[PDB]
Design a protein around this ligand. Structure first.
Ligand SMILES: O=P(O)(O)O[C@H]1[C@H](OP(=O)(O)O)[C@H](OP(=O)(O)O)[C@H](OP(=O)(O)O)[C@@H](OP(=O)(O)O)[C@H]1OP(=O)(O)O
Lengths: 37, 213, 56, 162, 176
RNA sequence: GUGCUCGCUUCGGCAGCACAUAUACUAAAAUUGGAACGAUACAGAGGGCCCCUGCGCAAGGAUGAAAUUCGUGAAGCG
RNA sequence: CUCCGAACGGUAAGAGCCUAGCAUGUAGA
């Protein structure tokens, strides 16, 4: 006014060794010159 | 004039309660920490012309987005028409609230910057420069379009009026008694600096409210 | 007043009709006439030939 | 109006790399098919991939059983039209999902003729596939709903030829 | 359509490709009798034909701002944005006068100050007459020196505002 | 790229050591389609929601969507 | 005896014809 996620969907041979697929999650910088989009 | 100056001084003396609060809130210190700001060293006249061009391009794109191809800001921050539209266009150009005041402020800023650009570009370059700044603050009293958006401005303009006779009757004494004394902006520019520092947040709020729409 | 047979429209003011065929979407549909700048030699032939036709 | 924690993504949309790097953005980009603010996060599926993002929002995709950025499926890998009209899907699907989706789309400066970036084009230097087949012409909203797919009829007739 | 040049134009650094003239004056240039004809397209060649057939050199006339065909043709060539070779060809033409006048005026509006002195200086020798339209409609015959002098030294010799050429002393101290 | 091995060993080289460890709304691009209360011709006025000007949830203008009598069923009492 | 103000409360509403500065950058085969 990191994350570890087991892909329980498809893991057989996608991504050879589709073991648990860890990732990195950052946030993107918001410039303070942008009106309401 | 002396009475008005003493009046402002005393009324400032009363409303002076010890300021201690806000936990040291700073601006333009977190902006430099993000990737949306970069520091450099550039001459003052260059920064002034840059700010003037940036403000003009910001207002021009506001007018462009607003689907008004029949108006033009004229590069001296004086909004001028094109074809005299009067079917329903004149009802779509009744700003009067913040566009007016932002226009006045940027007109004053670009005018000071142009007065200083003429110096480096071959103006009189003598005391004439200070005389120019003096009569520029005088015209900000009168010539500028400040009156409309806010009327309380007249108060400080009255100071800028009274303050005038604080200098000329101390400057135009002795041999120099008639001609236009150039004087200083030691008190005028001071007043307008305190003024703009005080009204930064109002225009921040108004720009936010208007950009929301 | 003025009459456009391509659009079959009646143009009233002379200026109103002048500002249709020059910009008509239907007339433009009869061919894109975006004029590209000719070569530097192309602008010389028009200058030379006119010097020999108008004057001479 | 719609924040989350982790995206409901595919197994091919994530990429052929066990460690990728996401970048959450609270309230970005306005969901394609319901027009609602949601939480856009992009990543790089692999080396020389397309820097894939997130289109279709959490409730948009969770309700209709579909991934947040390709609208195929989390369970099978078929479109949302084949998996509705049509079981047959299990022999129709595929394992080892081709990474021909995660690749850069065609450099238009090359199609015009002067791609100035040379060998350094981060886009892709192939010939623009001919326009004529309706697999040049699908969109998002007709895809996401069952109504009118260019793909789903062409794969649904693969289901009764042979 | 009078928005873009053809499809892409090297924007003059001053204001914009088409906006080197004031917005009011260009907006007036469009809606006009002389614009209604010849606006169908004029890329490189027909411009020469339209230029040699207009023996006026002026800007605005009448209470209602009425553009001369000289001024409207300057704006038309400005929208066309011809290459520098064609402009040097117009600047080198001695037979047709007002063509050379337009070439000089355009090279002044769009061009480098070094190039301005390099191409407009040798146009400071012709002692011939040139007709012009005053603001009240009445014409006047002046010298070509007056034109190029107001163009290179003075500001707004016509209705157009000039893009602030340097003083010649700075360039004489730094360059040729 | 930079500094060093009492290195193979010259001041040509080879081998090793150490510092430096992942940017990129990727593309200068590619098509796709739209709107003035704008001039011009014509006659010349009997409760809230959707918009616009707008800084104030200041202010100012507009088209579009209540009760009587009788029969029946059930609970419960002598 | 030099202190000088701006916006709204304002331009009837209309059927036929016509012209245009602006905007997306993607999913997928
Ligand atoms: O005419 P006066 O009542 O005697 O006062 C004038 C007048 O100041 P004010 O009208 O505001 O009181 C001038 O300003 P202008 O309004 O005429 O522009 C000012 O000159 P500055 O603009 O430089 O301030 C200066 O007059 P001068 O030109 O002689 O310096 C001044 O006082 P004096 O006339 O007594 O000097």
């Amino acid at each position: 006014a990191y994350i570890r996620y087991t892909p329980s969907q498809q893991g057989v041979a996608f991504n050879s060794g589709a073991k648990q697929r860890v990732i990195r999650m950052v946030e993107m910088q918001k410039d303070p010159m942008e009106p309401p989009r | 004039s002396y009475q008005k100056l003493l009046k402002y001084y005393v009324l400032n003396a009363l409303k002076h309660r010890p300021p201690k609060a806000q936990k040291k809130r700073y601006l333009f210190r977190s902006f430099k920490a993000t990737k949306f700001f970069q520091s450099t060293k550039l001459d003052w006249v260059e920064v002034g012309l840059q700010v003037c061009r940036q403000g003009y391009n910001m207002l021009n794109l506001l007018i462009h987005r607003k689907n008004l191809n029949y108006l033009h800001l004229d590069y001296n921050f004086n909004l001028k028409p094109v074809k005299t539209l009067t079917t329903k266009e004149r009802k779509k150009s009744r700003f009067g609230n913040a566009f007016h005041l932002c226009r006045e402020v940027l007109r004053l800023t670009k005018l000071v910057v142009d007065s200083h650009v003429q110096y480096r570009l071959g103006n009189v370059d003598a005391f004439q420069l200070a005389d120019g700044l003096q009569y520029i603050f005088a015209h900000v009293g009168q010539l500028t379009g400040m009156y409309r958006y806010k009327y309380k401005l007249m108060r400080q303009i009255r100071m800028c009026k009274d303050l005038k006779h604080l200098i000329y009757y101390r400057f135009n004494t002795g041999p120099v008694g008639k001609g236009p004394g150039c004087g200083f902006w030691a008190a005028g520019w001071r007043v307008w600096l305190f003024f703009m520092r005080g009204i930064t947040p109002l225009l921040e709020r108004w720009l936010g409210n208007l950009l929301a729409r | 007043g003025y009459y456009c047979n391509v659009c079959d429209c009646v143009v009233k003011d002379s200026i109103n009709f002048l500002d249709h065929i020059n910009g008509k979407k239907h007339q433009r549909n009869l061919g894109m006439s975006m004029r590209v700048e000719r070569s530097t030699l192309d602008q010389v032939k028009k200058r030379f030939e006119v010097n020999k036709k108008k004057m001479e | 109006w719609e924040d989350a924690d982790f995206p409901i993504l595919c197994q091919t949309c994530l990429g052929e790399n066990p460690y990728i790097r996401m970048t959450k953005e609270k309230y970005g980009k306005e969901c394609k098919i319901c027009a609602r603010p949601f939480t856009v996060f992009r990543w790089c599926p692999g080396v020389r991939m397309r820097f894939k993002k997130t289109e279709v929002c959490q409730t948009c995709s969770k309700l209709k059983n579909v991934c947040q950025t390709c609208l195929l499926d989390l369970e099978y890998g078929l479109p949302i039209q084949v998996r509705d009209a049509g079981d047959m899907l299990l022999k129709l699907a595929r394992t080892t999902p081709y990474y021909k989706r995660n690749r850069p789309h065609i450099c238009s400066f090359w199609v015009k003729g002067e791609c100035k970036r040379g060998e350094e084009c981060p886009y892709r230097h192939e010939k623009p596939t001919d326009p004529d087949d309706p697999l040049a012409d699908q969109n998002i909203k007709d895809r996401y709903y069952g109504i009118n797919d260019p793909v789903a009829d062409k794969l649904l007739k693969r289901a009764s030829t042979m | 359509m009078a928005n873009r040049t053809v499809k892409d134009a090297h924007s003059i650094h001053g204001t914009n490709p088409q906006y080197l003239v004031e917005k009011i004056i260009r907006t007036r240039i469009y809606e006009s009798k002389y614009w209604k004809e010849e606006c169908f397209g004029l890329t490189a060649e027909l411009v020469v034909d339209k230029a040699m057939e207009l023996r006026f050199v002026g800007g605005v006339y009448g209470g209602n701002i009425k553009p001369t065909p000289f001024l409207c043709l300057t704006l038309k060539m400005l929208q066309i944005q011809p290459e520098k070779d064609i402009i040097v060809e117009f600047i080198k033409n001695e037979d047709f006068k007002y063509v050379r006048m337009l070439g000089a005026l355009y090279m002044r509006l769009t061009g480098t100050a070094i190039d301005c002195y390099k191409y407009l200086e040798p146009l400071y020798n012709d002692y011939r007459k040139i007709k012009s339209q005053n603001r009240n409609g009445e014409f006047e015959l002046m010298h070509v020196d007056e034109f190029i002098d107001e163009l290179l030294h003075s500001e707004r010799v016509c209705d157009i505002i000039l893009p602030r050429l340097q003083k010649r002393y700075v360039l004489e101290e730094a360059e040729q």
